[PDB]
Design a protein around this ligand. Structure first.
Ligand SMILES: CC(C)CCC[C@@H](C)[C@H]1CC[C@H]2[C@@H]3CC=C4C[C@@H](O)CC[C@]4(C)[C@H]3CC[C@]12C
Ligand SMILES: CC(C)CCC[C@@H](C)[C@H]1CC[C@H]2[C@@H]3CC=C4C[C@@H](O)CC[C@]4(C)[C@H]3CC[C@]12C
Ligand SMILES: CC(C)CCC[C@@H](C)[C@H]1CC[C@H]2[C@@H]3CC=C4C[C@@H](O)CC[C@]4(C)[C@H]3CC[C@]12C
Ligand SMILES: *[C@@H]1O[C@H](CO)[C@@H](O)[C@H](O)[C@H]1NC(C)=O
Length: 1941
């Protein structure tokens, strides 16, 4: 058994090594694919970021001073790493580190709190007040003098504020960068420089395709109109800012805020009150503007006082201090004197009062001029949403539109606010997040904190407006007890890494690893099915191998070659840095499991098929289709049950995907795939794991293998035996010969007995019906008998079947040769398989190689051997194993006679004790070879004996053959013959030949001897030329045992051709399954799938409204922080936040959304924690810097997506409550919130992160009550009074504006910055969380300030977001995606529609690869009419298919194509595309030569061409650049017209574009009436496509239309024929050749050389040929297939070179290789070829019936011609040849594979045709056929006719003498006869001698002497039986072939 595995393994390895080209691709293809994967890896670096804590962003309810800071210092979202001061429990300022803050802190720390400074100031103020009324001090001032000194001393001014601020003071500072650098430090102190902003890399989200393609199209530039009714200065300013590429996005994003408007619809007095109370910030800013403007007037008064007042007298007195008060000046002077000089001014020098006053003047005038044209009256009224939107578009096109507030509940007469007030905010969609989706689809592992594209509710202007409106509503409904502000504070985020690869390596790795093995699968299945197509599997099984061994060895071979590639690929992956952290061994095992599943899938796939090419073409596609469902099941894994998963894992490719998902997800989180963490579901309770996936793949492999084995063993091909679904006429036998196979008493339901002998080559003869096949089956081990015994040398079949199989060779009818194996390896392998050892096999192989004659091709491929040598090798390998019994089956079936003789020589050399048993159909072979023939018929063994015994037992008399030169008269021949022997019958007379018959009973020897003496002496006197005697041929014995109608021509004949071709095509297509499937099904299903995947995207209108509450995010955790519990208002605020109404609005008393009901709650439980954590926290005293165990980030070589980090992080869990709103609420009161969030978020997301699709983080925000922003201890009244008194002293009166601005100062001061605010933590990874929790906070603020007489469970504020309608550009940008999906649909449609003509080309190739096309061309059909009729049929069929596809399109009701104004365009496009694509692929039928290879190439080419020609032009049209894009696209668009597919692709795409544009203009409301057939849009495609189709057809017709030496010496007959042709050329010679000569190009050796013969009517000029002489060539160019080089071949006078149609109508071909359509019925072929031949229609039945009757075959007449066998096929071809009674009828091997009693019938018909008077021309290898039916043979050796003449004359001159065989009575009696022949006949070779019978070969023409001697000495020689014969014709041809070499 193991020997079988070893042999098959060695053979498979040898074959794989021999192929040598599949091997390289095998090893290279996956390496190239995964090198592409490596390059993808190396061009996608991973983004790693440090911990990220953010500052808080103030809101307009926190006063305009902090809010402004929070909109200038936080335009970048700094993201520091250390926590900001703003996240501390009770601190909100976040800016104690700016220069101003520190300086002011110092200013308090030495001045306000100073013990004596306040007293000194009060004293100075009192003294100043006294002096003004009039109109023991000084020591206090000196005491203050040191205090200001160290106020200067503190290092907030020595360096800071005096090394930074003066930097801009020298000259003009740079405008943009370092001014912001200094101002940021001057206003907000921020550590670590400024911090690094996080970026956003989710381009594919938000559906912003500009970023990926890199398109610099921002937005249309806003319309400019000079007159805004505003000062020209800032009209010029807008001119400047709207032009430069610098500061163009910033101004476009900031103009709405500073200058835009706010439009509110209801206009009711209540809305007016709401938006008057929501107006505070604008009053504040406008008050600041008034103050700045009033300084403009107050200033000149200050200057006038400073130079013109009593202060001049005071300054003069101070200058007089050296004359008055020098002591006081010197006590503390010169610096004061310098200030006094400045007071004096009139000084060129700098650093004086003039300079500081001038700089203050300049800066304040500049600030006033800049501020003077803001817009602080933003509120405009309207009446309904319609006018609001109509004005909103008009404003927005100018880019002055902030937002629009709409109250959906109050009519224009409303006066009292309802409890549940509701409003909506409408804005442009470039300013608000989209309102249809609430979460990013694929979870990026970032914080989503990039200020430009993540935050858009903040810089856009949503949150500010919402805060203003909600504080307005709050202050309107309730009183003003105390105001509290709102700070938004983004939640912190842990330290992440963003690996952009993992998305790619998720989906791509499966499909790449499947494409890696789409070639190996095809090769393996092709090999497996090819081994079974050529019947070698049956041969192997017969010799003894089991069925399991074949499967096991196929598996081992494939597994070895695949394992090599898997090892290479795994090393390549691991050391190419695609996977970073993974045990390579487990990855290798995973790949091996997939390979095993794939190999067993190949085993199963090979079971369905039976062809070779078809399997190789289709198996890879089947493999890919099997993989395909994993793509569908990849976006639905969040709803897919584990039970479903395991069930849908039955496909190995699908299982691969489910494993690589865990591969990538384990590689991403850092640990990677290792042994310990395998088989464990990474997510929580998936129950699906890697190890179980591998086990499922192994189970898949086992199931595939068992199913394949059962299916094959139950459904074998045409060759195996399917299993049930369940599973005196006999020569005396002289005792000398030892019996070899003594089968006796055999029965089967044959009833016979016969004993084959030791050495003699017994021939077995029969009709194949009554035996000779079943008997050979029982004799071998193939099949067991019933009630019989077959004794093979003493080992009965039933009893022993091991030794019998060991010692009985067998050669089947077909040869048994592996490809790619040399003869030596074949012979060694076949010797070993029988059972010898290795060395014995080598010795036997060498010896029998020497005995065979193939030793010179010792190492030559078994494909390069010629057919004769292949058959000889097969017969030789039937002799291996030293088999003492051999059973051939038709040796030398179709080999040329020389190889036939060679195989006979082999058989003679190996008959020494072998008991050969040949079963043959030929009769000469069974006679010249067999030593005893045994015939069986009816099941009876009729006779069996020596061929001499049969020829002399019931054999007819010896016939007589005579030939003349016409020139011999008949009467005298018969006269003399009958006079010598009066019992002679002239049995047959043919031209130039005469055949008699003479009996052998009363043999009358003297008369015979006289007859031959007379015919030899007087040979030439009569008309004779030669004569001979033939003994009864064995074929006769074996058989005995068991004029033309008128033809149409002209124009009716062409109509006959058209009708006949059309009917033939239709009748073939109507009865075929596969054409209909590839013609009606596949296009329909592909179009249907494309359309079904088209409508999956619903049409989009305008963005829907979406109310704003947190519970749109599902189930979540939200916390709070009760801080600063002293204040009663905050206590009741906390109570309202917790218990009374709930968190937001869900449990409102009256009602709320009906989809969100709320129930009861839980009484404030606390989670239970393991004692580990309690002991951990008790054992170590954690400081306040770190309260919880710090947990580790992603270090090097351990990069983790989120930091896995130990238990106990974040501290003990806080008490919880499942609130009424059904949202678990925690309570972080005395507990770091930032630290807790940071070290709790990882585990929280890990517990909820499966598939990373629409993931739900369990916490989205919370509200932290309490935060105290310190405020200055200055009241408004004191400040204004101080300024008023100061102005009173310095003679300052102001005026109107200084009074209108300095009158409302207390409210201005009170609204500046607020106090006791609250924080709103918000997780921004949910898009609408910020505004939602802002709304919740304001609801709480409202509900906490009620007057306690009204229940707080019914008051609330509800915000709704819904954007305006989209304009031109946004609508176009949306419609681009629909255009893209329609383009994909168009590509799929062209692919589906191109599936149709590929079948047409398939049929064309299948018909051309036979001779069917050429045979029709011979019958008389022009090329042009052939192609025209085929084109008409193809057009009609494609019209049917396109009508079906149009119907499918209509079914879907697609408005784009099926509109009544668009349907004609679709119909025309489809029909014309067929019209233009069919002629394009007509020429492709000439290139290929095998269906299932042309189809793949045509489909792939069509798909690729369409994809490129559509996608390239569409994408390039999407662009706008003109360099390398626009002109190149235009020139490319013109070139790509040459492809028909491009044309219809753009047709469909342009129809979609026109429909989209019309849809847009209908939505806004216009009319766009572009009809599709407009030349620019569609109509160039139709014109160009039609012209292209017309050009293609002409090109196809053109391609079909296109692509001396002196006479050497010869014998007498060839030269005589030459002269009979050249001179006195005959008139009646039907076919006359004239120096026909053809030389192959590039060989300089003539294939033929100057043939010259003519054939008379009634002369079967059989034309033989030595192998390679080119008889095929002379036929191929006599018909017309191959062009002629010289000479001319006239037929019935018509030449062949010039006019050929008459020749074709005057001849009838019969190709060697049968050419018939496998679907048309038997009678239909005759119908067809009769119609082409032109016999009229009314009598077609008569001719068809004559032809069907003449050839038998009448019972197979009406049946599909593919169901016939070889004999019936040849009969049909012959009947086709004789269809119209043509004068010349040119056959070529008429009878191959036919059995006697049928071959005779075909020969008879031919003989009758010959006798009618019409010539024929034969060509064959079976020389018995020629000798039977031809009358003028001619042998052609090397391009020339070696010999010509009648059969008898040829075998006279060329042939040797008569062969006389005779037997004596015993074996000793035979010796004496011999020397008698040695005496009288000196020339005597004994050809063969055997026991009791010796056959002399005497080369003596004078046979009369042999006759008279052998009948005078009949007694004395003891001669009982004898026979005289003559050297047959084959001997002559073998002599020729032998002398050739
Ligand atoms: C006979 C009776 C009905 C006939 C067919 C009816 C319709 C067609 C389709 C036409 O396009 C070609 C001829 C063809 C195929 C006819 C010829 C053969 C036919 C089967
Ligand atoms: C319009 C004229 C010229 C041509 C019409 C051709 C039509 C009739 C042909 C084209 C494809 C054909 C089908 C192809 C395959 C099959 C499967 C076979 O098991 C039954 C017949 C059936 C179902 C054929 C019915 C006839 C059919 C629909
Ligand atoms: C992906 C696309 C382009 C190709 C699909 C797979 C190709 C290779 C397959 C699918 C259908 C197959 C054909 C189905 C039927 C037949 C008829 C048969 O008498 C010859 C082979 C032939 C013509 C096959 C050739 C190979 C084939 C064309
Ligand atoms: C930070 O801000 C507040 C303001 O008083 C306070 O915590 C502290 O004084 C400031 N300075 C620090 C913490 O250095």
């Amino acid at each position: 058994f193991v020997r079988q595995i070893q042999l098959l393994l060695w053979k498979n390895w040898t074959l794989r090594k021999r192929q040598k080209i599949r091997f390289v691709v095998e090893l290279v293809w996956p390496l190239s694919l995964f090198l592409v994967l490596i390059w993808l890896r190396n061009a996608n670096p991973l983004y790693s970021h440090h911990e990220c804590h953010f500052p808080n962003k103030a809101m307009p309810s926190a006063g305009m001073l902090p809010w402004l800071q929070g909109i200038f210092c936080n335009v970048n979202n700094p993201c520091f790493q250390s926590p900001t001061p703003g996240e501390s429990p009770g601190i909100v300022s976040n800016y104690n580190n700016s220069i101003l803050a520190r300086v002011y802190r110092d200013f308090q720390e030495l001045l306000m709190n100073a013990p004596e400074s306040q007293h000194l100031g009060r004293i100075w103020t009192e003294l100043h007040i006294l002096s003004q009324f009039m109109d023991s001090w000084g020591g206090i001032l000196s005491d203050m003098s040191p205090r200001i000194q160290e106020f200067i001393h503190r290092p907030s001014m020595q360096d800071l504020l005096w090394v930074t601020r003066p930097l801009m003071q020298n000259g003009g500072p740079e405008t943009f960068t370092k001014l912001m650098g200094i101002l940021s430090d001057l206003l907000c102190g921020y550590p670590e420089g400024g911090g690094s902003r996080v970026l956003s890399f989710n381009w594919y989200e938000d559906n912003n395709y500009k970023a990926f393609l890199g398109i610099d199209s921002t937005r249309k530039d806003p319309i400019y109109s000079y007159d805004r009714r505003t000062t020209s200065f800032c009209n010029a300013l807008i001119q400047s800012l709207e032009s430069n590429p610098l500061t163009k996005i910033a101004w476009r994003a900031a103009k709405p805020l500073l200058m835009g408007k706010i439009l509110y619809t209801p206009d009711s007095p209540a809305a007016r009150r709401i938006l008057k109370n929501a107006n505070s910030t604008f009053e504040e800013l406008e008050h600041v503007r008034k103050l700045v403007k009033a300084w403009e007037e107050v200033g000149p008064q200050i200057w006038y006082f400073f130079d013109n007042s009593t202060q001049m007298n005071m300054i003069r007195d101070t200058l007089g201090n050296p004359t008055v008060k020098d002591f006081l000046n010197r006590q503390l002077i010169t610096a004061e004197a310098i200030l006094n000089f400045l007071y004096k001014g009139p000084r060129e020098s700098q650093f004086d009062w003039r300079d500081i006053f001038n700089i203050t003047d300049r800066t304040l005038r500049l600030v006033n001029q800049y501020l003077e044209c803001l817009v602080l009256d933003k509120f405009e009224s309207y009446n309904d949403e319609t006018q609001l939107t109509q004005r909103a578009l008009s404003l927005l096109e100018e880019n002055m539109f902030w937002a629009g507030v709409v109250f959906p509940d109050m009519y224009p007469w409303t006066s009292s606010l309802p409890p549940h007030v509701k409003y909506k905010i409408r804005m442009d969609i470039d300013v608000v997040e989209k309102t249809n989706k609430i979460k990013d689809r694929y979870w990026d592992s970032g914080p989503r904190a990039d200020p430009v594209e993540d935050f858009r509710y903040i810089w856009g202007g949503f949150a500010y407006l919402q805060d203003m409106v909600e504080q307005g509503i709050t202050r309107s409904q309730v009183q003003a007890e105390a105001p509290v502000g709102i700070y938004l504070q983004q939640m912190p985020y842990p330290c992440f890494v963003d690996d952009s690869f993992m998305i790619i390596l998720n989906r791509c790795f499966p499909i790449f690893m499947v494409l890696a093995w789409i070639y190996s699968v095809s090769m393996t299945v092709k090999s497996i099915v090819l081994e079974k197509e050529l019947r070698l599997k049956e041969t192997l099984k017969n010799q003894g191998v089991s069925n399991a061994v074949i499967w096991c060895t196929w598996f081992l071979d494939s597994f070895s070659i695949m394992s090599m590639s898997i090892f290479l690929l795994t090393i390549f992956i691991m050391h190419g840095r695609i996977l970073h952290y993974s045990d390579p061994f487990i990855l290798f095992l995973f790949l091996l499991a997939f390979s095993t599943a794939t190999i067993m899938l190949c085993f199963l796939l090979s079971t369905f098929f039976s062809k070779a090419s078809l399997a190789a073409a289709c198996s890879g596609v089947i493999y890919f289709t099997l993989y395909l469902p994993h793509i569908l099941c990849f976006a639905w894994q969040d709803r897919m049950t584990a039970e479903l998963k395991k069930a849908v894992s039955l496909l190995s490719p699908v299982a691969f995907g489910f494993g690589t998902e865990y591969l990538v997800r384990f590689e991403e989180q850092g640990l990677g795939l290792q042994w310990s963490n395998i088989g464990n579901s990474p997510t929580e309770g998936d129950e699906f794991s890697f190890l179980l996936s591998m086990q499922m793949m192994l189970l898949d492999a086992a199931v595939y293998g068992l199913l394949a084995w059962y299916l094959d063993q139950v459904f074998p091909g045409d060759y195996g035996t399917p299993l049930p679904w369940y599973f005196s006429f006999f020569e005396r036998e002289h005792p000398g010969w030892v019996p070899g196979v003594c089968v006796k008493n055999l029965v089967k339901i044959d009833r016979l007995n016969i004993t084959f002998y030791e050495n003699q080559i017994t021939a077995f003869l029969g009709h194949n019906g009554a035996g000779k096949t079943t008997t050979l089956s029982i004799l071998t081990g193939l099949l067991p008998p019933t009630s019989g015994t077959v004794l093979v040398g003493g080992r009965d079949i039933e009893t022993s079947l091991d030794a019998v199989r060991q010692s009985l060779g067998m050669c089947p009818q077909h040869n048994i040769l592996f490809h790619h194996l040399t003869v030596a390896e074949h012979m060694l392998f076949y010797a070993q398989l029988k059972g010898k050892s290795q060395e014995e096999a080598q010795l036997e192989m060498e010896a029998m190689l020497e005995d065979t004659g193939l030793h010179h091709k010792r190492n030559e491929e078994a494909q390069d051997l010629s057919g004769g040598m292949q058959r000889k090798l097969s017969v030789a390998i039937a002799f291996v194993g030293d088999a003492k019994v051999v059973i051939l089956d038709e040796p030398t079936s179709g080999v040329d006679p020389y190889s036939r003789r060679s195989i006979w020589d082999l058989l003679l050399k190996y008959r020494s004790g072998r008991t050969i048993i040949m079963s043959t159909h030929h009769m000469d072979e069974a006679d010249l070879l067999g030593d005893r023939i045994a015939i069986i018929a009816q099941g009876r063994l009729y006779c069996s004996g020596t061929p001499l015994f049969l020829k002399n037992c019931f054999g007819t008399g010896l016939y007589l053959t005579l030939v003349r030169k016409l020139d011999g008269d008949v009467n005298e021949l018969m006269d003399v013959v009958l006079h010598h022997v009066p019992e002679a019958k002239l049995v047959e007379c043919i031209g130039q030949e005469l055949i008699f018959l003479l009996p052998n009973k009363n043999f009358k020897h003297r008369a015979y001897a006289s007859l031959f003496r007379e015919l030899e002496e007087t040979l030439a006197d009569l008309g004779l030329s030669s004569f001979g005697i033939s003994d009864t041929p064995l074929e006769e014995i074996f058989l005995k045992v068991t004029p033309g109608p008128q033809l149409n021509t002209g124009t009716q004949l062409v109509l006959q051709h058209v009708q006949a071709l059309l009917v033939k095509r239709f009748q073939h297509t109507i009865r075929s399954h596969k054409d209909f499937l590839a013609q009606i099904v596949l296009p329909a299903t592909f179009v249907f799938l494309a359309l079904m995947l088209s409508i999956v995207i619903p049409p989009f209108g305008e963005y829907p409204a979406l109310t704003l509450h947190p519970w749109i995010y599902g189930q979540q955790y939200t916390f709070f922080s009760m801080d600063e519990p002293g204040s009663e208002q905050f206590t009741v605020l906390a109570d309202v936040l917790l218990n009374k109404p709930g968190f937001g609005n869900r449990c409102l008393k009256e009602g709320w959304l009906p989809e969100y009901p709320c129930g009861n709650s839980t009484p404030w439980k606390t989670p239970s924690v393991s004692p580990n954590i309690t002991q951990l926290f008790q054992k170590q005293k954690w400081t306040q810097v770190n309260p919880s165990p710090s947990c580790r980030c992603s270090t090097r070589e351990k990069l983790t997506m989120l930091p896995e980090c130990p238990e106990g992080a974040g501290g003990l869990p806080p008490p919880q409550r499942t609130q009424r709103s059904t949202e678990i609420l925690q309570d972080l009161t005395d507990r770091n919130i930032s630290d807790f969030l940071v070290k709790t978020y990882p585990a929280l997301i890990r517990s909820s992160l499966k598939s990373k699709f629409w993931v739900n983080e369990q916490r989205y925000g919370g509200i932290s009550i309490g935060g105290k922003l310190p405020v200055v201890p200055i009241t408004g009244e004191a400040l204004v009074g101080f300024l008023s008194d100061l102005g009173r002293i310095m003679n300052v009166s102001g005026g109107p504006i200084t009074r209108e601005a300095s009158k409302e100062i207390p409210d201005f001061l009170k609204h500046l910055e607020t106090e006791d605010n609250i924080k709103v933590w918000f997780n921004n990874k949910g898009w609408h969380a910020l505004v939602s929790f802002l709304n919740v906070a304001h609801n709480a603020i409202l509900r906490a300030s009620l007057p306690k007489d009204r229940s707080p469970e019914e008051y609330g504020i509800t915000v709704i977001s819904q954007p305006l309608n989209l304009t031109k550009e946004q609508l176009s940008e949306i419609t681009v995606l629909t255009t893209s999906v329609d383009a994909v649909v168009a590509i799929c449609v062209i692919f589906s529609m191109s599936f149709v003509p590929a079948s047409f080309v398939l049929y064309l190739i299948q018909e051309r690869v036979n001779k069917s096309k050429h045979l029709q061309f011979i019958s008389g059909v022009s090329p042009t009419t052939y192609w025209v009729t085929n084109f008409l049929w193809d057009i009609m069929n494609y019209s049917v298919s396109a009508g079906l596809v149009v119907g499918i399109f209509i079914g879907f009701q697609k408005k784009a194509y099926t509109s009544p104004e668009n349907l004609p365009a679709l119909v025309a496009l489809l029909l014309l595309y067929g019209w233009a694509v069919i002629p394009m692929m007509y020429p492709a039928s000439f290139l290929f030569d095998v269906p299932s290879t042309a189809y793949v190439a045509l489909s792939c080419a069509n798909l690729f061409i369409g994809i490129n020609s559509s996608a390239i032009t569409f994408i390039l049209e999407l662009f706008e650049n003109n360099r390398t894009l626009l002109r190149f696209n235009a020139v490319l668009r013109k070139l790509l017209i040459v492809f028909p597919h491009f044309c219809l692709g753009r047709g469909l795409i342009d129809l979609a574009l026109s429909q989209a544009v019309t849809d847009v203009y209908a939505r806004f409301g216009e009319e766009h009436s572009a009809n599709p057939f407009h030349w620019d849009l569609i109509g160039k495609n139709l014109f160009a496509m039609v012209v292209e189709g017309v050009v293609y057809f002409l090109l196809t017709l053109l391609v079909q239309r296109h692509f001396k030496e002196p006479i050497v010496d010869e014998d007498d007959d060839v030269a005589e024929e030459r002269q009979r042709i050249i001179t006195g050329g005959n008139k009646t010679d039907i076919l006359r050749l004239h120096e026909l000569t053809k030389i192959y190009p590039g060989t300089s050796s003539p294939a033929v050389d100057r043939l010259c013969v003519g054939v008379r009517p009634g002369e079967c000029f059989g034309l033989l040929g030595v192998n390679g002489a080119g008889k095929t060539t002379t036929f191929k160019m006599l018909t017309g297939d191959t062009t002629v080089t010289s000479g001319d071949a006239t037929v019935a006078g018509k030449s062949i070179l010039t006019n050929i149609s008459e020749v074709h109508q005057n001849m009838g071909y019969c190709p060697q290789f049968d050419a018939i359509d496998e679907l048309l019925t038997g009678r239909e072929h005759l119908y067809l070829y009769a119609r082409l031949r032109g016999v009229p229609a009314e009598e077609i039945e008569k001719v068809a019936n004559w032809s069907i009757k003449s050839l038998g075959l009448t019972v197979y007449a009406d049946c599909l011609a593919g169901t016939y066998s070889g004999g019936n096929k040849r009969k049909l071809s012959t009947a086709i040849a004789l269809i119209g009674c043509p004068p010349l009828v040119l056959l070529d091997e008429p009878t191959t594979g036919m059995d006697p009693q049928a071959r005779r019938m075909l020969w008879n018909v031919i003989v009758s045709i010959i006798r009618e008077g019409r010539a024929v021309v034969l060509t064959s290898h079976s020389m018995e056929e020629c000798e039977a039916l031809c009358t003028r043979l001619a042998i052609m050796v090397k391009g020339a006719f070696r010999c010509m003449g009648t059969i008898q004359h040829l075998k006279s001159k060329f042939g040797d003498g008569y062969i006389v065989t005779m037997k004596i009575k015993l074996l000793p009696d035979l010796n004496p006869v011999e020397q008698f022949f040695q005496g009288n006949f000196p020339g005597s070779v004994q050809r063969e001698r055997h026991y009791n019978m010796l056959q002399f070969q005497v080369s003596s023409s004078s046979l009369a002497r042999i006759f008279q001697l052998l009948l005078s000495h009949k007694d004395s020689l003891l001669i009982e039986e004898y026979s005289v014969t003559q050297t047959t014709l084959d001997q002559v041809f073998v002599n020729f072939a032998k002398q050739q070499t």
